[PDB]
Amino acid sequence: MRLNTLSPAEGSKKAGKRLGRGIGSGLGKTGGRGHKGQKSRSGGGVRR
Amino acid sequence: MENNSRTMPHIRRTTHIMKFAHRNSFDFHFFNAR
Amino acid sequence: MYAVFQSGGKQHRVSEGQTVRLEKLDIATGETVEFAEVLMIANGEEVKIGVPFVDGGVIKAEVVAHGRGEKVKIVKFRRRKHYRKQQGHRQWFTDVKITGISA
Amino acid sequence: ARVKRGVIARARHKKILKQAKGYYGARSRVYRVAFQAVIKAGQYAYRDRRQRKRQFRQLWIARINAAARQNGISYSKFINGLKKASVEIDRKILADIAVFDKVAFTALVEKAKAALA
């Protein structure tokens, strides 16, 4: 039990989505937004 | 106005140079797609 | 004197002392392989053509080396469609040295 | 935690330009043109691992056809005769015996002429 032998539980530290970082990531060039329209814009989207 | 140009500080209004319809040799017969 | 035999889905034309590169075999290095299914043996226009196999033809060989081949790079690309993927590959071989063409 | 890019981006650009050696003009000097030329060389190399297997079989067949007609038979009757005589030698070895052992090729033709007759 040292400061460099501790480890979190398996499955508790899922990594976050990083949009627009190349082809191999699967989220490049649109960030999961599709092509044009209101929902693809910065600040876009309709109200509740 | 273009007030902080470092390449050309002496001039602020420059579209008499490259915009074709603002040159002194522009003729309105060039705009015949009407 | 040469002979023709099949190994690894492919056919080879070998002489004694010649070192031949095959596909991977499950044989330790230094151990002797025998090839019983030989296709043709020729020795000074005394040509034994197998129908499909020369009856009693055996090629013995000595396993000299295993190893991986030179790396080939596999590049897939689809233009204007936001797709590419890359891949490397090295192929296993087995080097054998032909010891005897016993007709 | 500010990250600078200079060491990583230079090593990535230097890796592409090493694969672009020998290319003409901007294709071996300029990253925007060299990266584009390294990818097209990879699509060509994938495609020509398939065409290499077609071009050699095309070459073996034309050499068997030439050497069989030196013995009085065409390609399509020589292949039919070796199939009837149950000879399982492939075209790579047949085209090789046709160049280096012309007597042993004559023995195969007479084997194929016998099974047809």
Place this chain on the structure above:
Amino acid sequence: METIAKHRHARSSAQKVRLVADLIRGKKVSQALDILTYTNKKAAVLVKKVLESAIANAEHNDGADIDDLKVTKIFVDEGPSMKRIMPRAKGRADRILKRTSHITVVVSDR
């Protein structure tokens, strides 16, 4: 032994000096000096003073003899450029480059 003389930041472009440096590459220095005397270029004046200085460096610092020296290497490199502004019509400004060059002459008796 080789012997170098250089003129750095010479006020001419490298393309104009390289025409004169191609005349005397490989020549004996007796022959190369008289080619430069009767070449009607400004760059021929600049290359002659560098060749005359490489000759004098080889006699004084290296103990050579004049009748065996040849121009083994000669090359012109590009120096820094001076940026100048040139007014054009209708308010336009262009940028004038005033190109300099580095001249290098190597004389050797072998």
Place this chain on the structure above:
Amino acid sequence: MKTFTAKPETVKRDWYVVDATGKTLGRLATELARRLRGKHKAEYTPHVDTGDYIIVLNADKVAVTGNKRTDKVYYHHTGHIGGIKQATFEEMIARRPERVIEIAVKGMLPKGPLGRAMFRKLKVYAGNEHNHAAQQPQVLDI
């Protein structure tokens, strides 16, 4: 083992002579293009000229079938505008009869630097005589 390729410094080339009297034009030209290319040799290589030298005699006596002697038209353009020119088969035979065999064989050869070098081994004559006796051409009755 790699497949054999013919090396151009060690290629055996032979000399033949063909009489073109009464032969059909195109059926003679396909055999000429085979042997100029080297398709009859087991050492055939697609980028090496492994063919033979062929002398063709009596080019003015080649035969065509049908009404082709007056109806086969040979076209060419000069490069100047309106400069399309034509000639019938009999006008070619009467003016320059070695060109009839040379045009037909050139269309059956590969296009490129190698096929232009294959064409150089074809020696066409209008008469019964040639002056290549020092090369000892063998009579090829094809």
Place this chain on the structure above:
RNA sequence: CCCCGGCGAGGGGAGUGAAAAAGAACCUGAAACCGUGUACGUACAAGCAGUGGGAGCACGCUUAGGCGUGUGACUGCGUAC
């Protein structure tokens, strides 16, 4: 301090320093871009300039041979992102 040069600019020696290719246009000194030298190719040859095959030449090896590196005649396929 000596030498060339216009009592220049610039340079070559000498000297200082661990280092002067640390010389004041000064730590390190990448790339575009521009040169000199060497090996190979190239003046009958048509196109995204590569890729698959491949002769010859040059330089290294090491052998009773044919491998490594550079170049690439000729040839199949092939209209950038």
Place this chain on the structure above:
RNA sequence: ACGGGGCUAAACCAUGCACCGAAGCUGCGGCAGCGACGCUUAUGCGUUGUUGGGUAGGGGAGCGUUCUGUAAGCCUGCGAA
């Protein structure tokens, strides 16, 4: 207004047997996903069936960079970045 050369068949009709022809199928070698059964696992291995073109997009698993702890440790002028 056959792709060209050329063709009186190398055209058309009928019958027949060969051969060529793809990244289809088979052979040999390798990797991975999802099922099923097990030398027994402790969550990995073994046997077997099958699957693996892909945009928008959803899911899974990783590389590398700068900074903090482990680190008053470890490497380094016998040469770090």
